[PDB]
From a paper:
In recent years, [name]-1 CA has emerged as a major drug target for antiviral therapeutic development. CA not only acts as the building block of the [name]-1 capsid core formation but also interacts with several host factors. Small molecule agents with different chemotypes have been developed in recent years to disrupt the CA biological functions in the virus replication cycle.
Author numbering:
A (entry chain A), B (entry chain A), C (entry chain A), D (entry chain A), E (entry chain A), F (entry chain A): 1 to 221
The structure:
């Protein structure tokens, strides 16, 4: 990450050993479960592209996922370049250049070059931009590596309602969808796929009911 | 959380790796037991809304609970908006806007926007306000996920009094109630549901007696 | 705890994650054994009332003990109020009020209000005062939860003297008593309840003898 | 690593105990798997040659690897000396000398001498240069210690496609090759060595297809 | 321990959670083995008397040892008072008093009073003085709790010489003695109590020989 | 270690709890294996003699080794004194004295005296000098405690060449020798003691060959 010198030359801050270790263990224990993402995100706050690649480099295994991820990164980088075309040729001595897609992703850019973009008036936050791309990729991986669909989540004859909701919302968090879409799945599937006894109860509460209410309503049954 | 630059531009402070890890393990080990709340609260002191969502995002499992929690968050946000209506249209260049319910909760607001509200003369402490909402929600979850009622806590024939009190006060901490209500449960249930031998002793101490006294009184028996 | 800004506005310092964790594990492993107290005390140095309640809130289980503790806290708070009566009515705009028993204990006082009292010329150290109350309560709990009395500590026929002393001093540390009282128990019980063979030796050293001497004297036997 | 004094004499910063420990455990758990390198690299950011040797010295076992590594280091040092020949004889009192290959590698140079080179206007980043050499060596070790070739990675009759890709990309990361070469292996081997049923599917997607697409295409089969 | 404010009012520094934990675990794992002392000493560098008592308070068990330790502390405190008699009566408003034996040990002195003594021109280092007393006591405990005497350390018929020396020097470190005395035990016992075969070899090296030499000399045998 | 005050009086920095713990565990797990030394060295960077003795004091067991180590320390101290003779008698009030061998080793010198030497214009780096002595001693211990000689390292009929090299270089690192000597052992033993099949291959590569080459050459066989 970045921080200010005594003299106020802007200076890079090495990633902590325990930030590194955190990220690795996360991955070893949790694979690509949706919570992985807010964690990757939280451990990389302030990161430059170099820092972000470091972090990604430290994952061993899961190399299929990692490759999809680069594909995702290339698609965004291409798109960046299309919306921000580079004026080429000579470069004005000492002054900074405009980052291409590759420069953002860290392939074609030095650390020194990166800090330069990030700490500018006005600042070009290349680390933030790269992180969006990564997280977009991380989402795709999560969706792909999810064993079941929201459509196949039905409540068991003997399943307490709390647990059915737990699997519905767990699965739903892993899905490909806008908020409009998730609402629609909630609104359509959740009660439609409850078990008979509790479904009757819930038809009868009508569609203003809170979860807290639905759950309490189906507690005794 | 937030802290002051060398130049005194107010700057965000990334959440520690061990704060993150703390919170996760808490949840894995203790579920929603009442002590979870003072811990969530203690690990989020100084937090912005982003920080608070991060923390919440890092919980995997318990997704029913998490959804009730959002419901709680929406109810408070709505109520906020009702008591603080936004003047809309154009916004004065450079100056900050008035946070809506959604802006407080972090849905419709940037980190930069948040720090801005929090560090103002006078400061609009959006992080503190969001935390109230969350904790209100966390309480509801705790109550709901409590296996037994204060009414069913009776002292065993062979139960030492210390243990009965331990279950009474454990259960009571999980209950829905003001202080007026808890006092009333204490004052009515605690002795009424002791076991025969010790109940006699306690009728005989009368209602000024301390716990220390009650416990000592029923020690030998 | 508290610390000074760059600008020297006095500012609150969030409790460390590892301070929190320390305290919890202590309690899980050691219950209310006398060493718990110097540890609670050491982990709460610099604490405000809020900090102290946080810490207390994080204990799950032991809720009987916790309730005795509040009782203890109320008794001290009442007594505080009796010796420091509050002048009521309006309050002078901007200036601080005199803390009541409840304000010290954190029930009726904000963090901001607390720091205000603590960092005053001259400082009203409300955190220190609350901590006395707590520790007084913690002592009562320790005494109460001690399985055996100093009177029942006798040396075994086959018990090395070092071990008997170990149980005597362990038990004695858990007892209700001034220093005058502990001395008297030492001076009366320790040798009176040694086993026959070693008692003879010790009668014969006379009452100026050090522990080091007594122990060495009864080493071979 | 290096940091600035109160007086701004540039001063060495001892390696953290947990940086040390990190590196050792990495090696004990992961041997020379490709992820080792980004980790060595991340734990040595800011390092001087001394720091880098320290770190290398702390590995026990793997001494064959360590010797190849020195060989690699000598080859680079020789080459350095060939492209940067030293003007010899007397040295100007007080002023710094030009580092030879050996001085970069830390054999013939003091810490004080190193900091001197690193913190110069303009700075001679000897630590960065040595690190390139090491990492070049570390790569060679990784390749050598890889049990299988990219050529022998075939998909099992019963192997899900995700797993085959996982072994292909794991093995490919361990290989000797430029990016041109890896692309060529990908482009030639990956589909050519899938199992029959899925190969047919993939011939039929044609060579623009993403991994995400290929994987999804072969999901049901 | 102690440190300087922004304003340079000298201020107390709370003991770290991990310093606390360190000390406790030491004791749980190692009892009173001689290495305990350099560790207690290393974890208490900079300590005030309060800090030192805290640390001592956190030991549970070993209460016989703890009592001998206080006895030791009283003997030193008495002696202090004899060599530094207090002028009594009124005290000059605001100025500091001369610490008695009890004030050094922390019984009769406040933290504020202690920092005052320690940070004076010239400084009265009460923490250093108390630590001497403690360590003197800790030594006595170590000696006492040592299972065997230097006199009973003989080399086994089948014991490698390295191991015999290991037990000799382990035992010798636990003994009551000046350096003059330890030298004499070394010089008299070490070879006199080696086993026959190796004793002959060693008589023959004569008394200038190093350990390194003695050990090498008896290697093959 | 040492650091600068706010006022720039040079001040001692207590050794971290985790530096202490690091060193102890190292020793418990790894005994005197050659990697111990770079670790002792890395954990003691910046150390004064006191700090270095502390660290050494914390080792329990291995007391034969520890005694050889002191012997080594005395030999160096004697030699120091011979090359730097002390002018004796009175000492100039306030000014510092010239450290003897004993003063360097910490026997006859205070911490305050040590910092004084270390932070002088020009600085007498007594901590660095003592550390050389120790490490010289630590080397001797390592050599002595090495179970096998470089001469007895032969490659097994069934031993992969990588493993034979691993034992050769492991053993060689533990040996008594200059670089001239190690080269000679390498150059003479390594191939001379390979197993028949691989020896033939290697005779045939001739003596310019790299390890990387030798190892690859004997891979299939
Ligand atoms: C911005 N934001 C979030 O990041 C919230 C923070 C939060 C998590 C858990 C409980 C409460 C809040 N996170 C999410 O919406 C992501 C999420 C977590 N679990 C899910 C399950 C299904 C789904 O579609 C999304 C999620 C958010 C905050 C408040 C609300 Cl009301 C909604 C979202
Ligand atoms: C403000 N405050 C609290 O947060 C106290 C702090 C505290 C916890 C444990 C022992 C002593 C004190 N916490 C509580 O009242 C919450 C609580 C903990 N256990 C309970 C059990 C039942 C219940 O209704 C509430 C609680 C508080 C402080 C002092 C008193 Cl006397 C009462 C409350
Ligand atoms: C102020 N103070 C304490 O806090 C001492 C510090 C200390 C603990 C252990 C060994 C030596 C010293 N602590 C105590 O007196 C509490 C205590 C610990 N074990 C006990 C066992 C019985 C008892 O009645 C009290 C204690 C103290 C210091 C010196 C002396 Cl001589 C006496 C007390
Ligand atoms: C500079 N850089 C890297 O260091 C990337 C960072 C990264 C790792 C994992 C997923 C995404 C990105 N790392 C690599 O290319 C090394 C690598 C990791 N796994 C591999 C597998 C095969 C291979 O030939 C190389 C690698 C990089 C960044 C973006 C792209 Cl698109 C490509 C490379
Ligand atoms: C001041 N000082 C010490 O504290 C040395 C430091 C040190 C420990 C271990 C190996 C080398 C050095 N420590 C000791 O003398 C205490 C000691 C450790 N093991 C022992 C075994 C027997 C004994 O009588 C004393 C000790 C010291 C330093 C150098 C020498 Cl040569 C002698 C002592
Ligand atoms: C100064 N220096 C060292 O401290 C190197 C650093 C280093 C360790 C491991 C791999 C590469 C480099 N360390 C050593 O030479 C000590 C050593 C480690 N393993 C050995 C095995 C045998 C031996 O005789 C010495 C060593 C060094 C640096 C570069 C070279 Cl090429 C040689 C030495």
């Amino acid at each position: 990450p970045i921080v200010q010198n005594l003299q106020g030359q802007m200076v890079h801050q090495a990633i902590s050993p325990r930030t590194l270790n955190a990220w690795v263990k996360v991955v070893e224990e949790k694979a690509f479960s949706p919570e992985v993402i807010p964690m990757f995100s939280a451990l990389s706050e302030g990161a430059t592209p170099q820092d972000l690649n470091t972090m990604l480099n430290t994952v061993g295994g899961h190399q299929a996922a990692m490759q999809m991820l680069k594909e995702t990164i290339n698609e965004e980088a291409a798109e960046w370049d299309r919306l921000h075309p580079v004026h080429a040729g000579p470069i004005a001595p000492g002054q900074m250049r405009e980052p291409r897609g590759s420069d953002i992703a860290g392939t074609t850019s030095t650390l020194q070059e990166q800090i330069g973009w990030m700490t500018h008036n006005p600042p070009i936050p290349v680390g933030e931009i790269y992180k969006r791309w990564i997280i977009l990729g991380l989402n795709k991986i999560v969706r792909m590596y999810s064993p079941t669909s929201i459509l196949d989540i039905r409540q068991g004859p003997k399943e307490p309602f709390r647990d059915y909701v737990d699997r519905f919302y767990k699965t739903l968090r892993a899905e490909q969808a806008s908020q409009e879409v998730k609402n629609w799945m909630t609104e359509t599937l959740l009660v439609q796929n409850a078990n008979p006894d509790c479904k009757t109860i819930l038809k009868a509460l009508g569609p203003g009911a809170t979860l807290e209410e639905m759950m309490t309503a189906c507690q005794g049954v």
